[PDB]
């Protein structure tokens, strides 16, 4: 009769189960890692390194818009009804070259370009023309890009998500990189084109093995914004079982700022003056004492949250990373090995 | 001057308060005392759908009431058979993070969306015997929170970029854009006639829209936190909402003001999903505390609980027939209630 319909509807259900089990042996054998953090944290450079060892193209698109924004400003200076007055008595071909890039068939983008505007950026007339060039349909991201010109000038510059927000080259809401360490398989998800309000889409990553929190130590108030974000992540009811691998990234810059000059962390963090380098501190060879104190004071600011709130369900793995570090993959691999073992030992009630 | 513009704004908004307060003469709970309560409403788990690896985020019932699609964060769309529990379709997605799914009223396509900012439409019945991706609607600069089908070529989506959108599936372009929400749009419910539809966002407000013109006809307030779910009353003249303030409210499009509040002091968790009975007499809501309450929509009393889930109840819904109630949860399991 129509019991034949069951034969296909049982055979079809079956020819799905044998692949759903094949999909289970691959899903459970791969660790999922969320790569959170602010844009200038170096998270993007860490990702580039991870892919190369084991989104970047947007740099050219940042460069072209910056060139258009700067050249636009030089033409604007003239367009002003009182054509603005330039503080530099002579352009020296700086402004002239900028003009010479007009409707370039495509811009090679050699360094002289930047050097030319790097100096013209603070020009009294240039700033005044840009302020007027507001009326001359001034670009929204021009001021921001003009401020970052030194950061962009570096050949090894790789744009932050704050930079890719200012430009419009982000279309894909999430970026993936699958890497394998010691034959183990890891899936890292760099959240792309999403708004700054995370209280809804952060609940999707409640089952990842670890959230990688990349932080900029040299930015000490960005650093306080990274501490309130960590605190809300650590205290969320849905992320209460998710471990957090903490990456205090910009170690080289933290060291220069602290050793070279006095930007007092004491200004923006008062209790640093009453802080002593810990006894379990392991300063590396040649590591100056204050920086070896600056590293652990910023590290203990996050550990204060994870201890005051952590009830024994989620753990925190701080690392004094640097974005170029080749060991970052291994650091993540060893922390995921520790997370899985602590989960098994809690099932047996051995911990 | 922003100050003058934001001052005429209170001059304009305060008058709406008195227009609704003047219309208030007798509470709905005050006019329903000549009728009897419905008593305790017990329901049982008839089926239990298994096969999803990760948590279940969304489920849309079929008008046929024979199939239903489920979206799970492990990158899988699964269409079930609520009578035989057999897996009809298994769709391997190219982006595991999905947050919604829809049952097209024609059964030829299914919808889904999530963190990839791309609404994917899959052709269930192509004339060679393989499901594959029919169309990818690109736009919306944010997560897709809810998508509902209009026909085989029109679909309304809601996103985390605080907007809604109408699409064209053949070309790929976006037809309409609904702007006005200041927070992430969470849920949407099409009206019976599909002339209107309501949307609840993270701004603690419900907005009544017009798919035809594109302007916000009405804006409903009274909730205290993000509205996570919204559904139309069957007669089309009302709608209920579920917020993070542990409260459900029954508004009314005609009177433009709230009519009933469904809350309990023992209830302190946010509502994740809402649905009405086929007669609209029972308001069913999914909660964060793993339970599902059965409210008397006419007397604001409680009349039953659907307590069979181990993790957070993410989705809810009644069949077009009006008997089965499906519940998804973060425990990877679906349940049919009756």
């Amino acid at each position: 009769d129509q019991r034949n319909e069951e034969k296909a509807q049982r055979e079809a259900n079956k020819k799905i189960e044998k692949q759903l089990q094949k999909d289970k042996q691959v899903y459970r054998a791969t660790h999922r890692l969320l790569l959170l953090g602010a844009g200038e944290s170096g998270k993007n450079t860490i990702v580039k390194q991870m892919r190369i060892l084991h989104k970047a193209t947007k740099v050219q698109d940042i460069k072209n818009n910056l060139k258009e924004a700067i050249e636009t400003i030089v033409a604007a200076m003239s367009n002003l009804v009182p054509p603005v007055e330039l503080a530099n008595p002579e352009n020296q071909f700086r402004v002239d070259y900028i003009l010479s890039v007009m409707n370039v068939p495509d811009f090679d983008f050699p360094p002289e370009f930047y050097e030319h505007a790097k100096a013209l950026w603070e020009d009294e007339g240039v700033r005044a023309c840009y302020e007027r060039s507001n009326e001359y349909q001034l670009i929204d991201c021009a001021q921001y890009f003009l401020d970052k010109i030194d950061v962009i000038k570096q050949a090894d510059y790789v744009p932050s998500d704050q930079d890719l927000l200012r430009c419009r080259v982000l279309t894909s809401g999430i970026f993936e990189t699958k890497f394998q360490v010691d034959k183990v398989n890891f899936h890292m998800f760099d959240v792309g084109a999403q708004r700054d309000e995370r209280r809804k889409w952060i609940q999707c990553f409640n089952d990842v093995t670890a959230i990688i929190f990349v932080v900029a130590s040299s930015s000490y108030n960005r650093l306080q914004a990274a501490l309130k974000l960590f605190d809300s992540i650590w205290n969320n009811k849905w992320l209460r079982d998710t471990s957090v691998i903490l990456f205090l990234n910009k170690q080289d810059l933290l060291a220069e700022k602290v050793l070279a000059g006095k930007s007092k962390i004491e200004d923006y963090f008062p209790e640093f003056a009453r802080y002593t380098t810990p006894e379990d501190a392991t300063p590396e060879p040649g590591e100056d004492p204050r920086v070896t104190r600056a590293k652990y004071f910023i590290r203990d600011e996050f550990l204060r949250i994870s201890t005051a709130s952590g009830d024994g369900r989620h753990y925190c793995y701080p690392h004094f990373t640097c974005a170029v570090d080749t060991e970052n993959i291994r650091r993540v691999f060893n922390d995921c090995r520790d997370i899985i073992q602590r989960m098994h030992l809690r099932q047996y009630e051995l911990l | 001057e922003l100050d003058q513009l934001r001052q005429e704004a209170e001059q304009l908004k305060n008058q709406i308060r008195d227009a609704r307060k003047a219309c208030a003469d007798a509470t709905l709970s005050q006019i329903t005392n000549n009728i009897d309560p419905v008593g305790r409403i017990q329901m049982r788990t008839r089926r239990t759908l298994r096969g999803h690896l990760a948590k279940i985020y969304a489920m849309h019932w079929g008008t046929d009431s024979r199939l239903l699609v489920s979206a799970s964060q492990d990158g899988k769309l699964i269409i079930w058979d609520s009578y035989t529990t057999n897996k009809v379709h298994a769709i391997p997605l190219r982006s595991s993070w999905v947050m919604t799914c829809a049952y097209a009223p024609s059964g030829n396509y299914v919808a889904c969306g999530g963190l990839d900012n791309i609404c994917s439409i899959y052709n269930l019945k192509t004339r060679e015997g393989n499901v594959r991706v029919s169309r990818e609607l690109a736009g919306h600069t944010g997560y897709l929170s809810c998508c509902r089908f209009l026909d085989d070529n029109q679909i309304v989506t809601s996103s985390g970029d605080t907007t809604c959108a109408l699409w064209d599936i053949e070309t790929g372009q976006q037809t309409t854009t609904f702007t006005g929400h200041t927070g992430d749009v969470m849920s949407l419910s099409l009206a019976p006639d599909t002339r209107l539809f309501v949307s609840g966002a993270c701004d603690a407000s419900a907005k009544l829209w017009d798919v035809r013109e594109g302007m916000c006809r009405q804006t409903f307030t009274g909730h205290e936190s993000d509205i996570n779910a919204i559904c139309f009353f069957p007669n089309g003249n009302a709608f209920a909402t579920g917020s993070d303030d542990a409260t459900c409210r029954l508004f009314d499009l005609r009177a433009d003001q709230e009519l009933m509040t469904y809350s309990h002091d023992n209830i302190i968790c946010g509502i994740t999903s809402v649905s009405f009975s086929k007669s609209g007499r029972l308001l069913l809501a999914g909660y964060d505390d793993f339970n599902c309450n059965v409210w008397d929509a006419l007397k604001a009393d409680r009349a039953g609980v659907l307590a069979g889930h181990d993790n957070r109840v993410s989705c809810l819904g009644v069949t077009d027939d009006g008997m089965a109630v499906a519940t998804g949860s973060w425990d990877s399991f679906l349940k049919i209630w009756n």
Partner: nanobody
Framework: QVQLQESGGGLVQPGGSLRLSCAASGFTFSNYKMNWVRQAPGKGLEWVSDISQSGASISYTGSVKGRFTISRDNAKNTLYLQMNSLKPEDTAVYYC?????????????????????RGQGTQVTV
């Protein structure tokens, strides 16, 4: 509906004091955590302080401790920010922000560019 109205502020001399008030309506004040946020001219939003539902837990940023003090009267739905020893660096629009969900331990997006449960603010110039 959820409405937060901030009062007080204006131009003041350095080393002075200021009393900022935030009148709430449209929600149960005793169920939510409160915050104070500011936006310096030419800079993003920065979290200033926060107080719990009852007040038994208070926090401040690393540049206002000892000077600012935040209090709330749950019986009258009011949030205060008593400011003292003001510097020309604390000049900004000060917003009264509410935590998204009630009975919650975290507040995720109180300093985002677009956040609903936040007043129009009051300008404080030093």
């Amino acid at each position: 509906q959820v409405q937060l109205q901030e009062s007080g502020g204006g131009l003041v001399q350095p080393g002075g004091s200021l009393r900022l008030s935030c009148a709430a309506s449209g929600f149960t004040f005793s169920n939510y955590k409160m915050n104070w946020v500011r936006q310096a001219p030419g800079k993003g939003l920065e979290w200033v302080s926060d107080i719990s539902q009852s007040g038994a837990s208070i926090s401040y940023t690393g540049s206002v401790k000892g000077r600012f003090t935040i209090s709330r009267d749950n019986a009258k739905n009011t949030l205060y920010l008593q400011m003292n020893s003001l510097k020309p660096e604390d000049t900004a629009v000060y917003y009264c922000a509410r935590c998204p969900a009630p009975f919650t331990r975290d507040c995720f997006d109180v300093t985002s560019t677009t956040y609903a449960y936040r007043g129009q603010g009051t300008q404080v110039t030093v």
